[PDB]
Amino acid sequence: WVKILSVVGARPQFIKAAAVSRVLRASPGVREVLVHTGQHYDDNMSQVFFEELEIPDPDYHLGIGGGTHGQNTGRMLEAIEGVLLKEKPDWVLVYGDTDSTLAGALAAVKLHIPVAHVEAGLRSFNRRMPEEINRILTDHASDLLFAPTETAVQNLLREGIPENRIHLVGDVMYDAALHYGAKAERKSRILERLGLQAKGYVLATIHRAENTDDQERLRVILEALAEVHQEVPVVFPVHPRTRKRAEAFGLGSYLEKVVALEPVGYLDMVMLEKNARLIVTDSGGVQKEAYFYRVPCVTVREETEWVELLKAEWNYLAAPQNAKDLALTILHRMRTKGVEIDLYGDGRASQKISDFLRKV
Amino acid sequence: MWVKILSVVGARPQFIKAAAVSRVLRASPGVREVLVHTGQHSQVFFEELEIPDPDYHLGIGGGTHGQNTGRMLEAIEGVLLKEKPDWVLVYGDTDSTLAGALAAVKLHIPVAHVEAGLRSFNRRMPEEINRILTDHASDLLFAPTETAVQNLLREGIPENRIHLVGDVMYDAALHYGAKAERKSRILERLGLQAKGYVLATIHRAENTDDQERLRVILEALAEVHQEVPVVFPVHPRTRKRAEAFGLGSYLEKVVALEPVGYLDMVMLEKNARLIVTDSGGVQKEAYFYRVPCVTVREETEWVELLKAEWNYLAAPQNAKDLALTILHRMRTKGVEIDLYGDGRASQKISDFLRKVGI
Ligand SMILES: CC(=O)N[C@@H]1[C@@H](OP(=O)(O)OP(=O)(O)OC[C@H]2O[C@@H](n3ccc(=O)[nH]c3=O)[C@H](O)[C@@H]2O)O[C@H](C(=O)O)[C@@H](O)[C@@H]1NC(C)=O
Ligand SMILES: CC(=O)N[C@@H]1[C@@H](OP(=O)(O)OP(=O)(O)OC[C@H]2O[C@@H](n3ccc(=O)[nH]c3=O)[C@H](O)[C@@H]2O)O[C@H](C(=O)O)[C@@H](O)[C@@H]1NC(C)=O
Ligand SMILES: [Cl-]
Ligand SMILES: [Cl-]
Ligand SMILES: [Cl-]
């Protein structure tokens, strides 16, 4: 048998790990160990993902979070190593691009434990972004690089990573949407709770530091969504950090002018995404999900790593410079669509991953 | 024009590199330096380098990679938040190096890597990962060799961030040569004459943490000693391992010493017939003095020394074979060639740090 240990720190990593774990559980000589590093350690940011997505309780919860980059990363590196020394996994899988991701990779490679990066080779080319540093360092530390796009493959080849370590497997978050979609239909009643008609609202999520730590950007965003809301209802599950910033800068009243919610579980999120007329976000996962449901998307950033979405016209960049401009862009984009194209694979990225963790 | 340049150093070879750089930075009064020592607070060997005492001793060491690295990352960041330097300099390829780079980059403090782009292409070595990741985290890459330059370019690091400045350890050797000649009495003390001995240092974990591999080395040196005396300043950790494994009697069969200071090291190296080492710095220094070298490893990053035939790899598989290799190479010389720059790597580094821009 082979032991495959997964390190997960945050909501989007739990969702990626859910897809992979589902395939590895069904595999003959594979034992899974799951380490939760403690970054997201809430109900609506963590536990709801474990229950709804049928993820077995983590074997370890490290309880680390809320410090500086150096504190969080340093403590995680030591604590993850401690677990690796006990468990002696044959593979460590790390996901996405947070400090957890880097800490796991760095803990493993120094113990000569093979590392594979799920969602490898994404680049913003903005080296000041902490996650840009994280994915670069993770990718160079890894033994296997599971890229979701051709752009990701090209990015890894450009940095001298050898072709035989890189596999274009598609996106496990597509696997997740495809596999949990029926379940979301059979359990979520969020549209009824909120009194929404299918295709009678816009859905917004905003959590990037660039957008929430800069008062003028966050004011543009919140004023824009209030304007949009007068035309078409805006539903907004608000990230807790985003809520705290809006309150801190005196912008809380804008949340009261839309249908602002606390963060929702994945099943409700699927139902909201599926039924939205348009999605406005700065989330990586959410902009891909918009495309999964063929809902037009606006990404409130100067760039995205998911460039194929822009090229296929499913997604559109709108930097938050002016509230009225952003509102008008949102309104205009909601009656657009992109081209016919199949991105991110067949929904079996996870069994491709599993197969490679046998063969290599 | 007032800029603060903070240097992160772990062990001996990093102090020697940082000393070379700091001797040049001291010539710019608008440059304030801060020196952060990641280990504990000997103070003589320290002073031969003409460096002020460290501003900080974080006192981290003796654990696993994850412990040492994780503790250092958090402690270095703490200092950076206090000191708010304009530049962080990291040196070489240890866990201290990577911890300093990681601490800085996430605070948006520019990092320069002294000794950038070296590659073994074997990730069994922790230092390989360390230097790859440090390089990809760095704003300025100070490469010692053309090979290092080509390694950095192949990994997609842009040309305008890479500078071939040569090796600060050649600067150091050039700077301290005369003082060593004037002040060192080690040959007199040991009873050796020029070209009458072989010098050995061994400190790599892979060579000292396996009983039978360390036995191969110590037995080889005992055999060599029967033909030509072997002078062996033993790294303290090498001696601890040797004692723990029950191999200490082998140290009595050569001229085993405690670690020596830099000036005495210059004198030993310069006057040796052959140097046998697993040190990166000593490999180069053997070449500086045109003394043949045998590297007790499966690879070296300093590949120019192999091509110029000044160095030769002898993995420690068999005591007899390693001894014979050592004795055969003692009668060799490499080709005349100018590696590692003009002794002014440190000046080039300082020039780049001071003009790069905010
Ligand atoms: C630093 C950064 O922002 N890195 C990116 C970051 O992802 P994301 O931005 O997508 O974070 P999120 O938006 O918090 O979660 C979305 C999910 O929550 C669900 N979601 C959303 C809201 C909600 O209320 N309920 C939900 O279930 C949605 O349905 C989605 O399934 O972290 C990822 C990771 O480390 O794995 C990186 O892969 C990633 N990098 C890229 C390039 O996409
Ligand atoms: C992991 C590893 O072994 N990395 C390498 C490691 O250096 P080295 O192997 O040279 O360590 P050392 O041999 O302990 O010191 C030599 C000096 O001590 C003097 N030395 C020596 C013995 C003595 O008794 N007295 C002395 O004065 C000698 O005269 C020398 O000047 O750490 C360096 C660093 O991080 O900066 C890396 O750049 C380097 N990687 C390469 C590629 O060379
Ligand atoms: Cl969010
Ligand atoms: Cl289609
Ligand atoms: Cl040594």
TrEMBL record, chain B:
Domain spans labelled UDP-N-acetylglucosamine 2-epimerase: 25-353
Presence of keyword Oxidoreductase: no
Keyword rRNA-binding applies: no
Keywords carried by this UniProt record: Isomerase, Nucleotide-binding
Highest taxon of the lineage: Bacteria
Record-linked Pfam families: Epimerase_2 (PF02350)
Coiled-coil parts of chain: none
InterPro entries xrefs: UDP_GlcNAc_Epimerase_2_dom, WecB-like
Binding site for UDP 2: Q40, H41, R237, K240
Binding site for UDP 1: Q40, H41, G62, H235
A single GO molecular function term of this UniProt record: UDP-N-acetylglucosamine 2-epimerase activity
Residue sites binding UDP-N-acetyl-alpha-D-glucosamine per the record: Q40, H41, D95, E127, H203, R204, H235, R237, K240
EC number(s) on file: 5.1.3.14
NCBIfam families for this protein: wecB
Protein family per UniProt: Belongs to the UDP-N-acetylglucosamine 2-epimerase family.
This protein's name: UDP-N-acetylglucosamine 2-epimerase
Species of provenance: Thermus thermophilus (strain ATCC BAA-163 / DSM 7039 / HB27)
